[PDB]
Amino acid sequence: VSKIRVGMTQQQVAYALGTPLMSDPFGTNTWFYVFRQQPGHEGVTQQTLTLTFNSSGVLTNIDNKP
Amino acid sequence: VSKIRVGMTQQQVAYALGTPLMSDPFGTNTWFYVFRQQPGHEGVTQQTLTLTFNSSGVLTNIDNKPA
Amino acid sequence: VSKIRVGMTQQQVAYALGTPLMSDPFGTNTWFYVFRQQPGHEGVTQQTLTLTFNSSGVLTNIDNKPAL
Amino acid sequence: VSKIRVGMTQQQVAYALGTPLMSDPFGTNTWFYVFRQQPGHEGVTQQTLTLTFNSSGVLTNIDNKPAL
Amino acid sequence: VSKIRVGMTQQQVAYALGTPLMSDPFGTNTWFYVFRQQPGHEGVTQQTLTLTFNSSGVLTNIDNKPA
Amino acid sequence: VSKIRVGMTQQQVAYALGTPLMSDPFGTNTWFYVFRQQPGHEGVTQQTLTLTFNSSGVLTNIDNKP
């Protein structure tokens, strides 16, 4: 924590402390859902969803898995 | 168990599905650390850190409250 | 690990092992909700709620973000 | 939400909103460690540790899994 | 920041990297639920559930302790 | 919780309660790492690792991202 200073880039902070446990999802390019402890789950593997957004915050790819 | 389509904004997707469990931290403005399971913890409350970055990804505020 | 002993205070245990991944919320003074993967979310930041309780486990402060 | 009020007990708040995603570990009676993404892990199940504290925040029970 | 190679067993990978943050629950023997942020919670402790499944994926023990 | 009974398959339980918050990683086919709050992080995106194991518990694929 003394390992960081105002003016550092996200790369410099992440090098010092690691990436954070949480961050705000708005403005970022990738959102990942894992649908746990939600009734109605189906299949032989954990349902997940990866969403890709462009720099304007618009959804460009929907990746279901499976 | 709900409907999205390409071209939706993040507000539309969050209304439909909720915010995601995880998202990529690079490019956003607020990072939040909670230092768990790390030896050397001190104090009477859980140590945390909130960082604010500007539109360019540079750190402008370090909030260690506590405290 | 072997670096903890019965009789230790929560500070000593937290200095040896760090705080735990999880703990029972009853009896503590601060609760933190993060409303994720819940349809109906609104706004331009992640909705959260920080509740402060006194010693008697009574709620004394409600802190919504964003502000209601 | 609007379904909580200052003066509520932790039970009333938990009935209205559920327990929180996170809480401050200090002051509670049970801590639970899950040692993941930590090099050195051994054995055939996930290593965990459950610590029980009394009212004074003093450790009274250590429960390692698997058993040491 | 540590070294794995194809052909390693899960014990070898866990020694090198630790266990993973997440894994697929299907096919294993122990499931653990912690019911957070769900309205209608009752009791003086966090409600949890530990389920044991046999090698075939069938439920053989329901542990609701608490209690 | 009264929604489940001994003898149900993992598919029946997951349909009633959802998948669990946690499960034991040994014996399963996919392990996912997200290296957060670990100093030394590098890059312009969150480092992760997906490992695939066969039914004998042997590592068959290493997928770094990026």
Residue D36 · residue E20 · CB < 8 Å: yes
CA angle E9, C3, C30 (to 5 degrees): 95
CA dihedral of residues D40, D46, D52, D58 (deg, nearest 10): 10
Residue D59 · residue C5 · CB < 8 Å: yes
Cis before C16? omega within 30 = no
Cβ pair E24:A46 closer than 8 A:
yes
- Reduce the DSSP state of residue D31 to 3 states and report it: strand
Backbone angles phi, psi at F39, to 5 degrees: -50, 155
Residue-range definition of the domain harbouring residue B62: 1-67
Residue C68 · residue C42 · CB < 8 Å: no
Cβ pair E58:F7 closer than 8 A:
yes
Q: Strands, E, within chain A: which ranges?
A: 22-23, 30-34, 48-53, 59-65
Residues from chain B that touch F21, judged by Cβ atoms under 8 A, are: none
Cβ pair E44:C26 closer than 8 A:
yes
For the record, the structure tokens of F25 come out as 């990683």
Residues from chain C that touch D5, judged by Cβ atoms under 8 A, are: 59
E22 DSSP β-pair partners: F32
For the record, the structure tokens of D53 come out as 């504290």
B12 vs C30: CA distance, rounded Å: 32
The one-letter code for the residue type at B17 is L
List, in sequence order, the alpha helices (H) in chain B: 10-17
Q: Nearest CA of chain A to the CA of C15: how many Å?
A: 17
Domains identified in chain C, total number: 1
Residues of chain F contacting B, Cβ within 8 Å: 34, 37, 44-46
C52 vs F3: CA distance, rounded Å: 34
B49 vs F16: CA distance, rounded Å: 38
Nearest chain B Cα to D48, which residue? B37
CA angle C45, D18, F3 (to 5 degrees): 120
Q: Nearest CA of chain D to the CA of F28: how many Å?
A: 12
Is residue D57 left, alpha or beta, with left meaning phi > 0 and alpha meaning psi from -120 to 50? left
Chains sharing 3 or more CB pairs under 8 A with chain D: B, C, E, F
Pairing of strands F22-23, F59-65: unpaired
The CATH number covering residue C17 comes to 3.30.1450.10
Pairing of strands E22-23, A59-65: unpaired
Residue B53 · residue B32 · CB < 8 Å: no
Q: How was this structure determined?
A: X-ray
Cβ pair D37:E45 closer than 8 A:
no
F40 vs A16: CA distance, rounded Å: 6
For the record, the structure tokens of E39 come out as 């309205």
Residues of chain C contacting D, Cβ within 8 Å: 2, 4-10, 13-14, 17, 19-34, 49, 51, 53, 57-62, 68
